[PDB]
Amino acid sequence: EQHSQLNQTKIAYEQRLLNDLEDMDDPLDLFLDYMIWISTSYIEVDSESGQEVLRSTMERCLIYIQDMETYRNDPRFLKIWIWYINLFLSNNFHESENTFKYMFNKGIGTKLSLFYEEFSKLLENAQFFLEAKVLLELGAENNCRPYNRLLRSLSNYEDRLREMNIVENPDSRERLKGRLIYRTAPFFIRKFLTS
């Protein structure tokens, strides 16, 4: 009874993606509605199908919306990228970093504090300690919003740096610059396009 209703809802959303997206003012909203439904209702009943459908839907969303310049600094869009990285790329630093680099190259999220906070966190966890600091400072120099929160994120990070006895001896900036040079789209994007 529940499973059947859930399956009809899945097909209803899939049809809407085919029929309705093209004419929408806010096509991102339809993807968001569907992803929220999958991650709550659908995955609670069928975790293995739900995982696959969530991953595919998120990839479709990113691919469909990515070349629409109007969405470049939409915080809702940014969050989908970061959810994707966290859910699906967490065991893969290179693909995670490549995703952030691809976004950076396309100007996705580059005016939003969250982008720099999350990208810095990735580098921090990977022990690129001073590159992670420079990335936060880069966000501030690009006038990213919310600005004050970014400044507090940087302050808290400097506190973590002191707890590990870390200071410079500008190579960290040049090291970050080297890390930021765009090379290739992440594999999940390339695989989607070729499939």
Range of the domain at 176: 77-195
50 contact partners, CB below 8 Å, separation of at least 6 = 38, 39, 42, 43, 44
Query: What 3-state DSSP class applies to 145?
Result: strand
Question: How many other C-beta atoms are found inside a 10 Å radius of the C-beta of residue 26?
Answer: 12
Domain boundary among 33, 57, 75: 75
> How many independent structural domains does the chain possess?
2
* Rounded distance between C-alpha atoms, residue 17 and residue 13, angstroms: 6
Which of 12, 107, 24, 96 is CA-nearest to residue 67? 107
Q: Token pair for residue 90?
A: 């967490």
Is the separation of the CB atoms in 31 and 57 below 8 Å? yes
Residue 82 one-letter amino acid? I
Q: Assign residue 19 the CATH number of its domain.
A: 1.20.58.2070
* Rounded distance between C-alpha atoms, residue 80 and residue 88, angstroms: 12
Q: Token pair for residue 101?
A: 């680099």
